[PDB]
């Protein structure tokens, strides 16, 4: 694994241009490599024994798996040394996704709704990255709009591997109660009270379904109530549906495939990828250009 | 709001209501 003592000072190799993100822990800046001018994202996090396992897990995931074109590509890691009365800071340096998150995009779109063709394109890109991780026995465990990013060219990249899981076998399971309630699968929530319950990669597929709804309706199901309430109604409520009858029958059938509550009747990542909403799609390059154009207009 | 982390912690991070 990664050893935080071997990391060097970033000196004046990168300059922080502006703040672009604040998620769960630390802050992300637009970074600029001062010699070449190359842009990168720089996630800055105070080093602390309390946060160090989460920081190492994200760094190892990125080192091993971000070569895939749907994961933001890892460049390196530094540590800014600070005087004795001030915590040291880890700089995690990766590919800059210049257009922000999917959540960002939904916020700045009129009516907080994406065109279905953009939803289909984004979902397929998410599914491809997920497919890469699941083949490598990784569960992401935090799929949601905030952690799906867009490049300046409307390419899609997953980020945020802090709470992801590395399994040993294909069949291997996990039972850690973790995530954001609105996006959590029922079988993940079941690990709160049931010590014998477990889940696997299929939980990422549920979260993907909630993310498609988030893109279609501007928020996940149940976001009108506090997260405690939602945690206890997700297992009891019937699986969420799209409310508007105007979406295509394809998209409705896809949401139905993602959101099977009984996870052993939920299709695996590979069957879901052949779903006509994902498979029967116009050219990647054509849809991408339209989305790139809308991102630029609304900027 | 919020998100569930390890060890009985939460943080601001997707929600509230
Ligand atoms: N590579 C990037 N390019 C551009 N913006 C980014 C990039 N990575 C993260 N961000 C922005 O910063 C936000 C937080 O980043 P994330 O990597 O999701 O931090 P967290 O939520 O603090 N992660 P963790 O603590 O590992 O669960 C994202 O939602 C984006 O808005
Ligand atoms: Mg995040």
Instruction: Label each residue of A50-65 as H, E or C.
Output: CCHHHHHHHHHHHHHH
Residue B11, H or E segment: strand B10-11
How many C-beta neighbours within 10 Å does residue A28 have? Answer: 20
**Chain B contact probe: residue of A21, A45, A227 with most B CBs at under 10 A:** A227
Mention every residue, 6+ apart, whose C-beta is less than 8 A from residue A275.
Answer: A253, A254, A257, A267
Identify all chain B residues contacting A25, using CB atoms and an 8 Å cutoff.
Answer: 11
**From the centroid of its chain, how far is CA A205?**
12
Q: C-alpha distances in angstroms, A255 versus A165, A176, A205, A206, A214?
A: 25, 26, 10, 9, 11
Q: Which long-range contacts (C-beta less than 8 Å, at least 24 apart) are formed by A31-34?
A: A31/A93, A31/A96
Of residues A140, A239, A138, A222, the one with CA closest to residue A186: A239
Token couple for A44? 């800055």
Residue of B nearest to A22 (CA): B13
Judged by DSSP in three states, A66 sits in coil
Q: What is the resolution of this structure in A?
A: 2.3
A168 tagged catalytic: no
Place of tokens 């409520």: A237
Ligand 1 nearest atom to the CA of residue A95, by list position? 1
| Selected residue of A21, A22, A24 to mutate for chain B interface (largest B Cβ count, 10 A) | A24
Strands (DSSP E) contained in chain A are: 14-21, 27-33, 39-46, 74-80, 89-94, 138-139, 148-150, 156-158, 165-166
Q: Taking the domains of chain A in order of start, what are their residue ranges?
A: 1-96, 97-299
- Cα A135 to averaged position of ligand 2 atoms, centre (Å): 23
Cα–Cα dist A103/A149, whole Å: 9
| Residue of chain A with shortest Cα separation from B16 | A226
Is the Cα torsion angle B3, A179, A16, A6 positive or negative in sign? positive
């Amino acid at each position: 694994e990664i050893d935080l003592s071997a990391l060097r000072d970033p000196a004046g190799i990168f300059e922080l241009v502006e703040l672009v993100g604040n998620g769960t822990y630390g802050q992300v800046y637009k970074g600029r490599h001062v010699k070449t001018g190359q842009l990168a994202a720089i996630k800055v996090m105070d080093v602390t024994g309390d946060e160090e396992e989460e920081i190492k897990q994200e760094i190892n995931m990125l080192k091993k798996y971000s070569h895939h074109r749907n994961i933001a590509t890892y460049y390196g890691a530094f540590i800014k040394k600070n005087p004795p009365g001030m915590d040291d800071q880890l700089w995690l340096v990766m590919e800059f996704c210049g257009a922000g998150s999917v959540t960002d995009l939904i916020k700045n779109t009129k009516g907080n709704t994406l065109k279905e063709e953009w939803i289909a394109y984004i979902c397929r890109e998410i599914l491809r990255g997920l497919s890469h991780l699941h083949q490598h026995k990784v569960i992401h465990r935090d799929i949601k709009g905030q952690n799906v990013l867009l490049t300046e060219n409307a390419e899609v990249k997953l980020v945020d591997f802090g709470v992801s899981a590395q399994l040993d076998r294909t069949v291997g399971r996990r039972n850690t109660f973790i995530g954001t309630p609105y996006w959590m699968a029922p079988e993940v929530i079941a690990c709160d009270e049931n010590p014998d319950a477990t889940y696997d990669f299929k939980s990422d597929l549920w979260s993907l379904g909630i993310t498609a709804i988030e893109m279609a309706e501007g928020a996940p199901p149940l976001c009108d109530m506090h997260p405690m309430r939602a945690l206890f109604l997700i297992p009891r409520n019937p699986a969420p549906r799209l409310k508007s009858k105007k979406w295509s029958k394809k998209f409705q059938s896809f949401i139905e495939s993602c959101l099977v509550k009984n996870h052993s009747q939920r299709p695996a990542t590979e069957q879901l990828m052949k779903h006509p909403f994902i498979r029967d799609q116009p050219n990647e390059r054509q849809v991408r250009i339209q989305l790139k154009d809308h991102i630029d207009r609304t900027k | 709001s919020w998100t569930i982390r390890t060890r009985g912690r939460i943080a601001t991070c997707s929600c509230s209501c």
